[PDB]
Design an enzyme around this catalytic site. Structure first.
Site, PDB file in Angstrom:
ATOM      1  N   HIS B  96       2.762  -9.701  -4.021  1.00 58.62           N
ATOM      2  CA  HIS B  96       1.500 -10.074  -4.554  1.00 58.62           C
ATOM      3  C   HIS B  96       0.689  -9.049  -5.324  1.00 58.62           C
ATOM      4  O   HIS B  96      -0.386  -9.223  -6.018  1.00 58.62           O
ATOM      5  CB  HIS B  96       0.404 -10.205  -3.392  1.00 58.62           C
ATOM      6  CG  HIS B  96      -0.328 -11.442  -3.465  1.00 58.62           C
ATOM      7  ND1 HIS B  96      -1.069 -12.034  -2.596  1.00 58.62           N
ATOM      8  CD2 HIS B  96      -0.687 -12.210  -4.571  1.00 58.62           C
ATOM      9  CE1 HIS B  96      -1.841 -13.022  -2.987  1.00 58.62           C
ATOM     10  NE2 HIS B  96      -1.594 -13.099  -4.165  1.00 58.62           N
ATOM     11  N   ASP B 119      -4.712 -16.368   1.703  1.00 60.39           N
ATOM     12  CA  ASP B 119      -4.002 -15.309   2.277  1.00 60.39           C
ATOM     13  C   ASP B 119      -4.423 -14.896   3.513  1.00 60.39           C
ATOM     14  O   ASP B 119      -5.697 -15.051   4.068  1.00 60.39           O
ATOM     15  CB  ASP B 119      -4.302 -13.915   1.189  1.00 60.39           C
ATOM     16  CG  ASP B 119      -3.089 -12.876   1.351  1.00 60.39           C
ATOM     17  OD1 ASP B 119      -2.678 -12.505   2.307  1.00 60.39           O
ATOM     18  OD2 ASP B 119      -2.849 -12.473  -0.069  1.00 60.39           O
ATOM     19  N   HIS B 121      -4.742 -11.956   4.279  1.00 63.30           N
ATOM     20  CA  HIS B 121      -4.990 -10.577   3.845  1.00 63.30           C
ATOM     21  C   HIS B 121      -6.033 -10.769   2.611  1.00 63.30           C
ATOM     22  O   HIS B 121      -5.849 -11.534   2.013  1.00 63.30           O
ATOM     23  CB  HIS B 121      -4.066  -9.483   3.734  1.00 63.30           C
ATOM     24  CG  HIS B 121      -2.930  -9.621   4.710  1.00 63.30           C
ATOM     25  ND1 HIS B 121      -2.038 -10.403   4.700  1.00 63.30           N
ATOM     26  CD2 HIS B 121      -2.834  -9.027   5.774  1.00 63.30           C
ATOM     27  CE1 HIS B 121      -1.155 -10.492   5.786  1.00 63.30           C
ATOM     28  NE2 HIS B 121      -1.746  -9.324   6.354  1.00 63.30           N
ATOM     29  N   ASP B 123      -6.261  -8.097   0.252  1.00 65.35           N
ATOM     30  CA  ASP B 123      -5.588  -7.420  -0.820  1.00 65.35           C
ATOM     31  C   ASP B 123      -6.517  -6.650  -1.588  1.00 65.35           C
ATOM     32  O   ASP B 123      -6.398  -6.601  -2.620  1.00 65.35           O
ATOM     33  CB  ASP B 123      -4.742  -8.198  -1.435  1.00 65.35           C
ATOM     34  CG  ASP B 123      -3.669  -8.902  -0.538  1.00 65.35           C
ATOM     35  OD1 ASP B 123      -3.512  -8.551   0.605  1.00 65.35           O
ATOM     36  OD2 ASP B 123      -2.792  -9.965  -1.116  1.00 65.35           O
ATOM     37  N   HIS B 136       0.588  -4.212  -2.839  1.00 65.35           N
ATOM     38  CA  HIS B 136       0.501  -5.633  -2.929  1.00 65.35           C
ATOM     39  C   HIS B 136      -0.662  -6.072  -1.972  1.00 65.35           C
ATOM     40  O   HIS B 136      -0.825  -7.080  -1.625  1.00 65.35           O
ATOM     41  CB  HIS B 136       1.682  -6.260  -2.217  1.00 65.35           C
ATOM     42  CG  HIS B 136       1.779  -6.159  -0.955  1.00 65.35           C
ATOM     43  ND1 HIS B 136       2.466  -7.044  -0.079  1.00 65.35           N
ATOM     44  CD2 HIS B 136       1.673  -4.973  -0.070  1.00 65.35           C
ATOM     45  CE1 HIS B 136       2.620  -6.492   1.152  1.00 65.35           C
ATOM     46  NE2 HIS B 136       2.076  -5.567   1.191  1.00 65.35           N
ATOM     47  N   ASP B 227      -0.518 -16.750  -1.325  1.00 69.24           N
ATOM     48  CA  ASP B 227       0.391 -15.905  -0.561  1.00 69.24           C
ATOM     49  C   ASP B 227       0.727 -16.548   0.589  1.00 69.24           C
ATOM     50  O   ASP B 227       0.120 -16.932   1.363  1.00 69.24           O
ATOM     51  CB  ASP B 227      -0.282 -14.557  -0.180  1.00 69.24           C
ATOM     52  CG  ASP B 227       0.497 -13.671   0.668  1.00 69.24           C
ATOM     53  OD1 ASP B 227       1.526 -13.874   1.296  1.00 69.24           O
ATOM     54  OD2 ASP B 227      -0.049 -12.451   0.834  1.00 69.24           O
ATOM     55  N   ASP B 229       1.995 -15.891   3.233  1.00 67.29           N
ATOM     56  CA  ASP B 229       1.660 -15.505   4.432  1.00 67.29           C
ATOM     57  C   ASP B 229       0.189 -15.975   4.916  1.00 67.29           C
ATOM     58  O   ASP B 229      -0.334 -15.643   6.018  1.00 67.29           O
ATOM     59  CB  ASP B 229       1.576 -14.044   4.771  1.00 67.29           C
ATOM     60  CG  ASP B 229       0.828 -13.356   4.083  1.00 67.29           C
ATOM     61  OD1 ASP B 229       1.174 -11.908   3.882  1.00 67.29           O
ATOM     62  OD2 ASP B 229      -0.505 -13.281   3.709  1.00 67.29           O
ATOM     63  N   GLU B 272       5.164 -13.917  -2.102  1.00 61.38           N
ATOM     64  CA  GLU B 272       5.541 -13.247  -1.121  1.00 61.38           C
ATOM     65  C   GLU B 272       6.777 -13.974  -0.160  1.00 61.38           C
ATOM     66  O   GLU B 272       6.655 -13.772   1.014  1.00 61.38           O
ATOM     67  CB  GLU B 272       4.085 -12.807  -0.257  1.00 61.38           C
ATOM     68  CG  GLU B 272       3.345 -11.946  -0.879  1.00 61.38           C
ATOM     69  CD  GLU B 272       3.651 -10.282  -0.926  1.00 61.38           C
ATOM     70  OE1 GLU B 272       5.001 -10.186  -0.278  1.00 61.38           O
ATOM     71  OE2 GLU B 272       2.813  -9.587  -1.060  1.00 61.38           O
TER      72      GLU B 272
HETATM   73 MN   LIG Z   1      -1.335 -11.208  -0.389  1.00 60.98          MN
HETATM   74 MN   LIG Z   2      -0.788 -11.402   2.889  1.00 62.21          MN
END
Ligand SMILES: [Mn+2]
Ligand SMILES: [Mn+2]
Ligand SMILES: [Mn+2]
Ligand SMILES: [Mn+2]
Ligand SMILES: [Mn+2]
Ligand SMILES: [Mn+2]
Lengths: 314, 314, 314
Positions: B96, B119, B121, B123, B136, B227, B229, B272
């Protein structure tokens, strides 16, 4: 809330064979006993004896039509019997081609019925729009008055008369719909809640509008045709045509608890369970147990609990 | 709805190596063919050739900065090319960190763009708030005009100019946010729907407000930075930083179906996916297949079905 | 938001033995350290030392009553201690029979408390309605003023005084309720959200109405009694009485995040984790990790993130 159990060990609506043992492992899972354990009045009408039709060449690309034809014919016969005996018909399948006969026979006695079709597929291909040829992906096209003129004369089906109009059916769970099926959807203005709509509104609103859509003008008998692939393969893996992103276990029970509560359930189909396709022993029991749970919910079993109108603090 | 496919085989935005083969197994899964099977006009811009930067010592605790720097630089170049060619850029990642270049290049041609960031996260660490050093987990801090003054001069990034303000981005799926990231969240008043909000309101309302938030004042191009995840590890396990309690498969498709329907998707990032981290062959195909499904949904594939404006009852 | 940790290694409220090691593997999972890592002020009150009662024949069909009796007695003692020390009591279980003592002691100091009971079961059987005899399926019947007159004198429980009325408790997660339990439910008009209601309204509305129901008349201390089998066995398999179709991981965290946010959490029970029943090492850590996550959420850990009232852009 009296039930008429009809086993329908038929598979020639599609290619894979073990779907014919559906009525067998469901009965084995103690279905009718659990129903009796419940509030229920249960009469087993036996497993319909589907005889071989050795001479059954395709019609165009459509496979095993006389076989599919006569078996729905038969089943149509028996469901009308159960209905005329004042009981809810419970068809244990068998592939979903049998819906043709189940809804057909149901409507001979209850022509005003409305249909709820729980499935990953619309099963509304016509013989001329099918690409696979498999009749379990076609039953709805046979049944709809509006598709009258677009169903050629297929051998084994001359007994059929379309008994429901586009406005009397609702789909729940869709996620694998062909483009001609979708055309038909939009063209005849059929009401559907695809997984998109269930995600958008939630199963509560979905069921609200579904029931309202079918009964808001006036109470009428309901035929619930449940294809276990409407639920996610994590819950019903042993099935011929699984598709990821389905209805949860919870959503499956919610759907049927609400239907139960209408008091209007009149015909039920439990279809496409194929134990021979589980990848493991556990995949088989997982699928069977789920189909059992969905079936019990249809007949009053409630997750909040149930009790008799008796005083339990003795 | 024309697409420009850009493979971005880069991994030095984080420690684990196999994320660089993302563009390879997605292409292998038949992505561009499925897109063509769909309604789509697809031009492959090739896999960007990221050359080694052997001399790349940390900046403070920040790892591989010139490498991350030049690769986003490059990608920024190519995305602006695709955008100037009137096509939606499709960046196959790669970690990412590449968002820096993707959003950068997108905004050179479409400075009014709004960002949806899916996501687990945020980021949005800065070099001075990162604890890991991995770039990332930082791309958003580079991109935000308001964090101007708080981003030191990191080698490899002197070409960067922050191109989006705090109010032009929305997060969906958050569940692993650092405390300095959260400070930044609340401080710059950034709009987010963490898993708490998705649970509270449901994905339908989440997407309603997300789109309304970004387009209610006026239609504008959308950059979706996805992303994988953000989705639950039960759906995309082969990924570097999984976190339990994520977006479902269904929620993932819902998110992108709605974006598709805006008609305003302008840039997409699919990031990712790391096949080398699946614990099994199946974990790899599960992740790839899901990233594929999310990608197809972005470009018109709908679960209720699709058909051409033709008469299918011939 | 100060905590008093009380380990309650007790199992004789039901048949399977390993539930007694709950306080041990939770502590092992770093519970108290994670709490300290959090915003929290933590005092460990130790693991209560439950001595053997070798002479403990059934009362009628009710099993191990003096043992269950004295252990709740003990725990009642200790919780009142923690409460009188101005801290939230955190009872690590142990089977759910211990709720009797936990809520009992909590109410000696905070008689106006309201109860949220998260569970697949209602645990409100009486000695005369129990069919199993297991006391962890009975604690609520002991505690309710309205069931006064219907609880015989069971040895080990003469110290008990019902401390909560039917209107001061709410159930969330129900899906395995006996018929006499349901009678009691409906008869005393107890407020519940079974899985049906969670499916219907969504966890957001469920929690809205739950909190409103208990605090709308006036703020009061809350006792959250969490039985980890309220969550789906896919999340907490290592537990004695699992039931499919439960609360998700997400729903579990949502429930507790909202409670946390009331600022009124006063007593917490984390119950029925039984590592010896995981079918695998991973099933054990999955269950422990989840019970940990639920516990941290109760004390401020938020998925959107957390930070100190400090300036993080230094
Ligand atoms: Mn990310
Ligand atoms: Mn993530
Ligand atoms: Mn189907
Ligand atoms: Mn079907
Ligand atoms: Mn329980
Ligand atoms: Mn319990």
């Amino acid at each position: 809330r009296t039930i008429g159990i009809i086993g329908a060990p038929f598979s020639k609506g599609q290619p894979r064979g073990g779907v014919e043992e559906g009525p067998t492992v469901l009965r084995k899972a103690g279905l009718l006993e659990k129903l009796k354990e419940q509030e229920c009045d249960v009469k087993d009408y036996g497993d319909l004896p589907f005889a071989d039709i050795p001479n059954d060449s395709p019609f165009q690309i459509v496979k095993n039509p006389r076989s599919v034809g006569k078996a729905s014919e038969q089943l149509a016969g028996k469901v009308a019997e159960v209905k005329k005996n004042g009981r809810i018909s419970l068809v244990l399948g068998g592939d979903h081609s049998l819906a043709i006969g189940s809804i057909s026979g149901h409507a001979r006695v209850h022509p005003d019925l409305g249909v709820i079709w729980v499935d990953a597929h619309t099963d509304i291909n016509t013989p001329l729009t099918t690409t696979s040829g498999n009749l379990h992906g076609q039953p709805v096209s046979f049944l709809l008055k509006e598709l009258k003129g677009k169903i050629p004369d297929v051998p084994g089906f001359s007994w059929v008369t379309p008994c429901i109009s586009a406005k009397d059916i609702v789909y729940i769970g869709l996620r694998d719909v062909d483009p001609g099926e979708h055309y038909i959807l939009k063209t005849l203005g059929i009401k559907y809640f695809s997984m998109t709509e269930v995600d958008r509104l939630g199963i509560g609103k979905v069921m609200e509008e579904t029931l309202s859509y079918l009964l808001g003008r006036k109470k009428r008998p309901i035929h619930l045709s449940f294809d276990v692939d409407g639920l996610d393969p994590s819950f019903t893996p042993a099935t011929g045509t699984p598709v990821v992103g389905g209805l949860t276990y919870r959503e499956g029970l919610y759907i049927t608890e609400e239907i139960y509560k209408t008091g209007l359930l009149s015909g039920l189909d439990i279809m496409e369970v194929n134990p021979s396709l589980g990848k493991t022993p556990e995949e088989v029991t997982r699928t069977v147990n789920t189909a059992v749970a969905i079936t019990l919910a249809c007949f009053g079993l409630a997750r909040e609990g149930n009790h008799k109108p008796i005083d339990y603090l003795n």
